[PDB]
């Protein structure tokens, strides 16, 4: 999911409305829809992708 989410943020300070977009994007490509509370971690995409992968 690492290079995938790398290119996803190639498509950062955390705004409180981008959470809806990043919640919506997960639902089709990987069909996971991870909880929004679990999407509320840090302001990163690559390092947050690393940590929330493993």
């Amino acid at each position: 999911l690492e290079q995938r989410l790398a290119e996803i943020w190639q498509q950062l300070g955390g705004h409180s409305l981008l959470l809806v977009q990043m919640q919506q994007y997960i639902g089709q490509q990987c069909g996971q829809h991870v909880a929004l509370v679990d999407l509320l971690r840090f302001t990163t995409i690559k390092r947050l992708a690393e940590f929330l992968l493993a």
């Binding site: 955390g14 909880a35 509370v37 840090f42 302001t43």
Partner: protein, 867 residues
């Protein structure tokens, strides 16, 4: 182990006690007050904020922010206009918190400590522009600690929005490591704009409709509110051997922080709120199947709400049961308080633990999109609802979070059950004392038990009137009440000073004076009620009876107590053979009783029989020798022949001049009153011819004519009886009767004084313009009637009175109300009665109405908005 929460106090929005808070949660009322368009453009707010689409003009507000009663504490009215309005209200709340526990701060044996927290100083735009250095967030608690004599630690903890529940979590460690012995720990939030709105934002934290819905899918934000509130804490092994009221027993606490394991500076965390909760519940000793009521923060924001629910479901992970634990919020009812909002939930949970009823959460229809109630162990009420768990013991938990992060979780077990039937029963009557430093704060404190006592919510009379006597301080303007049932007293206290109970200012009065009574005023059921109630009267009465059983044959406690009521029993004791020693024993037993309640006598007069016991209260001779003299004297003076009596209403010189016969003067009492005596025919001769004069002449109804001219032989015989015994110099300032003046060392030591006592006329009037001249004293009778106290206030005793001790014959069953009315009428004047011996067997305290302060405006009038 535990830390009890003994008393509470507050001043919330649209409720000004903690029994108007608990009658606005139970009725499920919305306490938020909406405004108009005219209530803002007259309170000096700008015309650009108003008339704005999203300018929500709601706030949950308190009424009187500018009402201090300065003179109660000693503050001049220029150090009252130079105080932050959050200092005055925390003073008037820190007084009522110590009065809702039945304690006084100033005279507790241990130490007392205050750990509170101030809000943002908003008086730096109200007082700074006109004048002002010396009132910042640092000296709230020393001002609370100086005016009430608090001699423990005095700190100001200052976390951001959980100040009020970090203060409790410091004061629960200060007690548990013995820094102090009783604490007090709260917060405050009050500001000059009590009438203001808020420009709400689409995407912010402020609710754009006015209402604060918590855990609902229509959540918009919160709404700002103001308040106050303080509690009182004490160790749970020192709140069980003293008998206080315990609301709840705090069993665990923890305080933490986040620290850069989140998004931003202001963004919540989950991994720290799941550690505060699961350290509180593991320090307490519990397990998450037991916490039945959890008080979430529940502020009503967008992201602040699924984070908190996730944190709760993470920490309740061990419980394998479905939908068994409540969840709620306060901030739907009263809005969001800012700094005092950790303790306004601690009050609600610590009351709902004690009563056993979970109040209702307003504004709740459907859960949020990111929450599943049905697959989690929580549920949300909407109607008020009873509470009883499966295990039988109710437990709880309150949580508050701060801006930086504090996660203050506390755990509140139910107070243990008590044993209220092992107490010995209530006493027959009790005194209810009410004292207040000014008159207008006494009338409004009397019209405040009017509404308390006429409910069906009312405590015992033994646990009340030990909170009103031992649990407050006795100020000047005091009034008291002796009652049997409380509803009638509630009716009596509301009739607004057209009522029969004691009243009046109390000054110093260092010393009380004693009037001792004479013959002829006794009755049948006399001295019976006090014998089987009080121990000192019964003990000191018993010694006088047992000695005279030992050395004579008259049985006492037979004719007064156990003998049958008849006509012949009335005149059996009215004979002179029995009337002397019974009356002496009664007056000595009553004197012994009145000393133990805290009376120091100064002057001790007599009237024809009070010399024989006013002497022995000065210790001039022993009690045994006193009884051996009095019984001998009464037997020796009984065998004299027939005599008579008369009362004449003419002065002493006129009777000593205008008499017809050589008749001896028996007694001089008042300057309208004297008694003449003589033989059984000459008195009848002068009485009938004086009736023709139409000057009044009753009799005294005695077979022997005392103080006449035929008692030399018996007097010399008892002088021969005198010289076996020995005497002593006196102690107290007796004045005499036949001499008309004071008493020296050898005045009572001479055996001839008791000889001339029976022959010379006793002159009561000359002993009573001299006593009130050399002393300035009130007079308390010790005697079986009310004759002397009717005579004594008939003189020129200016602004002094006289009181009795026993009922006047006809009210012979009021010997337990009449003395207890004398006590409550002496205590109003200022005397040193301790009203704690009239309490009961073993009392506890109860929450009673506090002091009723005055209300004076002290403001700079905000010149900025005045222009």
């Amino acid at each position: 182990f535990g830390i009890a929460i003994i008393g509470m106090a507050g001043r919330f929005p649209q409720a000004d006690t903690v029994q108007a808070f608990w009658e606005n949660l139970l009725a499920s009322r919305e306490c938020i007050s909406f405004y108009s368009d005219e209530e803002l453009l007259a309170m000096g707010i700008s015309p650009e904020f108003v008339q704005h689409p999203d300018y929500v003009k709601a706030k949950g507000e308190v009424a009187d922010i500018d009402k201090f009663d300065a003179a109660f504490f000693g503050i001049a009215p220029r150090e009252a206009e130079l105080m932050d309005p959050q200092h005055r209200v925390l003073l008037e709340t820190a007084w009522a918190a110590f009065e809702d526990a039945g304690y006084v701060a100033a005279d507790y044996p241990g130490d007392v400590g205050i750990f509170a927290g101030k809000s943002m100083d908003s008086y730096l735009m109200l007082n700074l522009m006109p004048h002002f250095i010396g009132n910042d967030k640092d000296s709230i608690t020393t001002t609370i600690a100086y005016h009430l004599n608090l001699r423990g630690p005095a700190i100001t903890v200052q976390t951001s929005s959980s100040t009020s529940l970090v203060a409790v979590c410091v004061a629960c460690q200060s007690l548990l490591t013995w820094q102090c012995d009783m604490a007090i720990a709260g917060g405050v939030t009050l500001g000059p704009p009590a009438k203001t709105g808020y420009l709400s934002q689409e995407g912010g934290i402020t609710a754009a409709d006015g209402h604060c819905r918590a855990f609902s899918d229509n959540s918009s934000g919160f709404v700002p509110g103001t308040g106050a509130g303080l509690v009182v804490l004490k160790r749970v092994d020192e709140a069980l051997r003293d008998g206080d009221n315990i609301y709840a027993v705090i069993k665990g606490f923890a305080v933490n922080n986040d620290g850069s394991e989140k998004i931003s500076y202001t963004a919540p965390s989950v991994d720290a709120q799941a550690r505060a909760i699961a350290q509180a519940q593991r320090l307490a000793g519990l397990t998450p199947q037991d916490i039945t009521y959890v008080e979430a923060h529940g502020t009503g924001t967008r992201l602040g709400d699924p984070v908190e629910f996730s944190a709760l479901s993470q920490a309740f992970a061990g419980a394998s049961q479905k939908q068994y634990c409540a969840l709620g919020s306060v901030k739907t009812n009263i809005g969001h308080l800012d700094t005092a909002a950790g303790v306004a939930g601690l009050i609600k949970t610590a009351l709902a633990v004690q009563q056993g009823i979970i109040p209702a959460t307003l504004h709740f229809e459907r859960p949020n999109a990111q929450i599943d109630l049905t697959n989690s162990p929580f549920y949300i009420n909407t109607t008020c609802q009873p509470w009883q768990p499966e295990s039988g013991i109710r437990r709880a938990g309150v949580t508050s979070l701060g801006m930086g992060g504090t996660n203050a979780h506390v755990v509140l077990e139910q107070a243990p059950a008590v044993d209220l039937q092992a107490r010995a029963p209530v006493p027959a009557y009790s005194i209810l004392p009410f004292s207040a430093k000014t008159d207008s704060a006494l009338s409004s404190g009397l019209a405040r038990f009017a509404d308390f006592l006429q409910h069906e919510s009312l405590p015992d009379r033994r646990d009340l009137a030990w909170t009103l006597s031992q649990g407050r301080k006795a100020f000047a303007h005091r009034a008291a009440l002796v009652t049997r049932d409380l509803h009638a007293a509630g009716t009596l206290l509301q009739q607004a000073a057209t009522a029969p109970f004691a009243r009046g200012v109390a000054q110093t009065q260092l010393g009380l004076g004693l009037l001792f009574s004479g013959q002829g005023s006794q009755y049948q059921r006399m001295g019976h009620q006090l014998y089987q109630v009080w121990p000192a009267y019964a003990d000191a009465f018993d010694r006088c009876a047992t000695l005279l059983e030992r050395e004579y044959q008259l049985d006492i406690r037979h004719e007064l107590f156990r003998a049958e009521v008849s006509l012949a029993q009335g005149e059996r004791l009215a004979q002179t053979c029995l009337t002397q020693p019974l009356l002496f024993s009664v007056e000595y037993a009553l004197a012994q009783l009145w000393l133990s309640w805290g009376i120091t006598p100064t002057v001790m007069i007599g009237h024809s029989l009070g010399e024989w016991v006013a002497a022995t209260l000065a210790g001039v001779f022993s009690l045994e020798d006193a009884l051996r003299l009095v019984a001998r004297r009464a037997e020796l003076m009984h065998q004299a022949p027939s005599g008579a009596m008369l009362m004449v209403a003419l002065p002493e010189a006129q009777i000593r001049a205008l008499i017809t016969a050589p008749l001896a003067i028996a007694a001089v009492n008042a300057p309208d009153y004297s008694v003449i005596a003589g033989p059984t025919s000459e008195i009848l001769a002068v009485s009938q011819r004086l009736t023709e004069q139409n000057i009044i002449n009753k009799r005294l109804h005695t077979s022997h004519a005392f103080h006449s001219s035929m008692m030399q032989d018996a007097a010399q015989a008892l002088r021969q009886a005198f010289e076996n015994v020995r005497l002593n110099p006196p102690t107290l300032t007796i004045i005499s009767t036949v001499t008309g003046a004071h008493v020296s060392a050898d005045t009572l030591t001479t055996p001839d004084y008791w000889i001339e006592q029976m022959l010379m006329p006793v002159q009561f009037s000359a002993a009573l313009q001299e006593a009130q001249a050399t002393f300035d004293v009130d007079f308390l009778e010790i005697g079986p009637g009310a004759t002397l106290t009717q005579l004594t206030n008939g003189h020129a005793l200016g602004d002094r009175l006289a009181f009795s001790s026993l009922p006047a014959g006809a009210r012979s069953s009021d010997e337990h109300k009449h003395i207890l009315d004398t006590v409550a009428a002496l205590w109003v004047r200022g005397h040193n009665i301790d009203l704690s011996a009239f309490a009961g067997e073993q009392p506890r305290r109860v929450s009673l109405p506090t002091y009723a302060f005055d209300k004076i405006r002290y403001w700079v009038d905000s010149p900025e908005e005045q222009r």
